[PDB]
Design a binder for this molecule. Structure first.
Ligand SMILES: CC(C)C[C@H](NC(=O)[C@@H](O)CC(=O)O)C(=O)NCCCCNC(N)=[NH2+]
Length: 209
């Protein structure tokens, strides 16, 4: 595949976000993926609402927990998601409004587990959301350079792989521009089930046209 690919320079990836003192990693991640797939086939780059998710994906748990195989189905079975402007962020759950369906997808497809060689495939076609063990000190206290550091698998956080390189990943978090490398964190590539288990639960939204 292309040795090195970045969806941030292609104009597919929106600026960094900030989930806030709220356990909504599961929403931010799974949502920024549906943002870049819609900015690839359609050609439009919109910032959808992570709040319509905390307020409507009842299946999940707003600010305290969430999974990918349930944030996606929500967005499809409902006709779509609403933008951020319309449905701004509040940093906490609440009722579920009369929002519109500005975007949507046909489904979602999972990538072969603990297989990074082919995860580089999906991430080479479009941003793929993943889960990791983002509770370690070095992880939580990463700033620059390529993060090798300590962390045992057993995922707890969700993010978006927006690119990669000869030996590292370009992970997209959701803790503001003041964390890691301007909101992002480059995680080394290859290892088995991945660094902080990166290749354990891969996933990305699909689309027609
Ligand atoms: C794979 C990714 C999506 C991890 C996921 N984490 C979350 O949804 C959030 O808590 C993420 C966050 O940092 O806000 C997760 O596994 N959450 C578990 C749900 C609650 C389990 N915890 C309990 N019940 N002690």
């Amino acid at each position: 595949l292309p040795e090195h690919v970045d969806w941030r320079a292609k104009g597919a990836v929106i600026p960094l976000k900030n989930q806030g003192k709220c356990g909504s990693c599961w929403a931010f991640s799974t949502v920024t993926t549906v943002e870049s797939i819609n900015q690839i086939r359609t050609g439009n780059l919109i910032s959808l609402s992570e709040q319509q998710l905390v307020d409507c994906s009842k299946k999940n748990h707003g600010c305290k927990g969430g999974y990918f195989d349930r944030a996606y189905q929500y967005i499809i079975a409902n006709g779509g998601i609403d933008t951020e402007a319309n449905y701004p962020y509040k940093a906490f759950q609440g009722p579920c409004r009369a929002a519109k369906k500005v975007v949507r997808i046909d489904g979602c497809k999972g990538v072969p587990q603990c297989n990074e060689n082919a995860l580089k495939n999906a991430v080479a076609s479009q941003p793929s959301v993943v889960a990791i063990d983002a509770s370690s000190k070095q992880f939580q206290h990463y700033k620059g350079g390529i993060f090798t550091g300590p962390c045992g698998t057993k995922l707890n956080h969700g993010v978006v792989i927006v690119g990669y390189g000869k030996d590292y990943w370009i992970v997209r978090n959701s803790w503001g521009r003041h964390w890691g490398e301007q909101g992002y964190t480059r995680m080394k590539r290859v290892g088995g089930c991945g660094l902080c288990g990166i290749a354990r639960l891969p996933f990305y939204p699909t689309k027609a046209x």
